[PDB]
Ligand binder design. Structure first.
Ligand code: NGA
Ligand code: NGA
Length: 583
């Protein structure tokens, strides 16, 4: 027929190459369980045969429970998934380019060419004052060349528990933002950086970050701190210069505007100690510091070795000046100096220096680092670092070491996350199954950490809406949101199924934590459910990208995330029911 349609999973992509199998789909009903103030996602997958089909549109009804309580269609947004091209390899110019439905794009009508797949993402926001019950409604697909519209029957159960607000949880989330990348893409000239004209293209995506639980805000403190690994250079938010007396001076202009923005948006709250400023880095690439030398009127650069007299000298100047500046602003207590996975001799020199430099309340800078930890219960150096993030590929699954390490840090009130990056599986690539994201968040809880860190909020390539390929890494690795179109009026970014799955994991671990606290009879049962989590094996495709080790491993990833979720909602249910029977 002209247009086929079926409900599909949000957990994996429906790709053009799978057209003939996709056409056999025939799911006409959907159901899910939600808390008050939760969100659900779904998907409709469609296909054409030999004719193009025009003006394809989806509309939701209102949803109504058994008492007539209403959740308006206002709370349902239906968005076309847009495809972009991705080189399917890693550092491999000859890998093929294939299309991936990675972009949650716009609402409205689509014209679909012949012999194509197209899917639409469905987002359902449950109001924070919604009534419990089973809600029913429908989603209707029409098109010009379609005689009989499709009606898909949707229901969900709202449980009588309230989804926690981010600020009511102890989940740590940190995604690295690249505000000069947003400037580049949207044609913000040098003169307008960190002016209102730049802020208009930042605010939307930062609120997005905030609302899902983002707490870490990165800021660069030297020039090109990652040696231009990304498509866009990384400028320093603190400009360095050397004066005629041979000592250094620091312009905090961009730094201050950046942090203030994040304070204004409610991401950081320095007075109450909410959120973090992560200052990258005291061990930037090759220890290289580029600075304007006033005596010679040109740019110079030096590479002092950590723990040398010269390194100690320069970095004492920076840290004492920075600490004063921060104290004047009232920002010091939420500021962390970031290291990185360097020689342990270099990290020791960093921690030694930092602990030497105190303010007049006897406090030194907090310290943050990605750390290569795999075993052993010697926590003597790790305990000196306030926030650490351990990469997934360094975590040995058949072992309690990570969990033991993290539990120690939890007892000391220190922070711990896991991160993913290039080479990881599960991960958060364009080519990934989006459900890898929910698995990733569950795994952060399995390891008894506070949550999840990723380097990659927005590190866009030239035109990611059309091709995400970059010279390094699996495709889509550097960004979890897309920009909007360069000429956009209105939208400033687009979400991704992979991001929405992280969001899902974050909401569902927050449920598990809420119940563990409010239901002491169930806490240990809940812990055991989480401890049953299995971790899949990984391999590589032919082009160097990390992928599941087998179909069984790939199915595990999806079946595990959903199993824990459903188990948590059953605990939620038994808890509600027993509270009622026993009230
Ligand atoms: C609202 C907010 O950000 N709260 C955090 C809390 O969740 C926890 O992480 C704690 C660390 O000791 O700091 C708090 O101020
Ligand atoms: C904490 C972290 O993400 N570190 C690096 C990051 O800088 C970047 O190189 C990324 C590329 O995927 O790999 C990560 O290992």
């Amino acid at each position: 027929t002209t247009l086929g349609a079926s409900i599909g999973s949000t957990d994996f992509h429906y790709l053009q190459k799978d057209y003939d199998e996709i056409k056999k789909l025939n799911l006409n009903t959907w159901n899910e369980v939600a808390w008050i103030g939760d969100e659900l996602n779904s998907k409709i997958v469609m296909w054409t045969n030999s004719s193009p089909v025009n003006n394809v549109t989806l509309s939701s009804s209102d949803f109504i429970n058994e008492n007539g309580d209403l959740i308006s269609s206002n709370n349902i947004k239906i968005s076309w998934l847009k495809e972009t091209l991705a080189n399917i390899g890693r550092s491999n110019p000859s890998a093929p380019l294939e299309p991936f439905p990675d972009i949650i794009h716009n609402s409205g009508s689509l014209n679909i060419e012949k012999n194509k797949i197209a899917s639409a993402w469905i987002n359902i926001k449950i109001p924070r004052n919604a009534k419990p019950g089973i809600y029913n409604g429908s989603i209707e697909v029409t098109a010009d060349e379609l005689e009989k519209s499709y009606t898909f029957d949707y229901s969900f159960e709202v449980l009588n528990l309230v989804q926690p607000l981010p600020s009511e949880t102890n989940t740590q989330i940190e995604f690295w933002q690249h505000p000069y990348t947003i400037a580049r893409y949207y044609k913000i000239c040098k003169e307008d950086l960190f002016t209102e004209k730049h802020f208009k293209y930042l605010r939307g995506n930062l609120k997005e970050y905030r609302n899902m639980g983002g707490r870490g805000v990165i800021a660069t403190i030297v020039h090109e701190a990652w040696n231009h690994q990304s498509y866009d250079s990384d400028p320093s938010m603190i400009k360095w210069r050397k004066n005629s007396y041979g000592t250094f001076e620091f312009d905090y202009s961009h730094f201050d505007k950046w942090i203030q923005l994040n304070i204004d948006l409610g991401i950081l709250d320095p007075e109450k100690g909410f959120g973090q400023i992560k200052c990258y880095s005291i061990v930037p690439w090759n220890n290289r510091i580029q600075y304007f030398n006033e005596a010679t009127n040109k740019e110079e650069a030096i590479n002092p070795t950590p723990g040398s007299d010269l390194w100690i000298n320069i970095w004492t100047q920076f840290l004492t000046s920075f600490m004063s500046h921060l104290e004047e602003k009232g920002w010091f207590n939420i500021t962390y100096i970031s290291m990185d996975e360097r020689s342990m001799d270099d990290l020791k020199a960093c921690v030694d220096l930092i602990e030497n430099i105190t303010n007049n309340s006897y406090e030194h800078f907090k310290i943050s680092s990605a750390m290569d930890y795999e075993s052993g219960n010697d926590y003597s150096f790790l305990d000196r670092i306030d926030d650490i993030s351990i990469g997934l590929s360094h975590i040995n699954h058949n072992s309690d070491d990570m969990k033991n390490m993290a539990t120690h840090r939890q007892e000391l009130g220190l922070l711990t996350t896991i991160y993913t990056c290039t080479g990881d599986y599960p991960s958060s690539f364009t080519i990934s199954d989006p459900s890898e994201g929910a698995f990733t968040i569950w795994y952060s809880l399995y390891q008894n950490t506070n949550g999840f860190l990723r380097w990659s909020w927005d590190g866009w390539v030239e035109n990611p809406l059309e091709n995400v390929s970059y010279k390094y890494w699996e495709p889509g690795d550097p960004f979890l949101i897309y920009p909007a179109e360069k000429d956009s009026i209105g939208k400033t970014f687009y979400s991704t199924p992979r991001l929405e799955k992280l969001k899902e994991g974050i909401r569902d671990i927050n449920k598990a934590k809420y119940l563990m606290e409010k239901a002491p009879n169930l806490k240990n049962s809940i812990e055991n459910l989480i401890y049953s989590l299995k971790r899949p094996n990984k391999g590589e495709n032919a082009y160097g990208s990390a992928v599941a080790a087998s179909k069984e491993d790939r199915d595990l990833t999806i079946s595990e995330a959903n199993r824990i979720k459903n188990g948590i909602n059953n605990f939620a249910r038994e808890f509600i029911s027993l509270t009622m029977e026993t009230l």
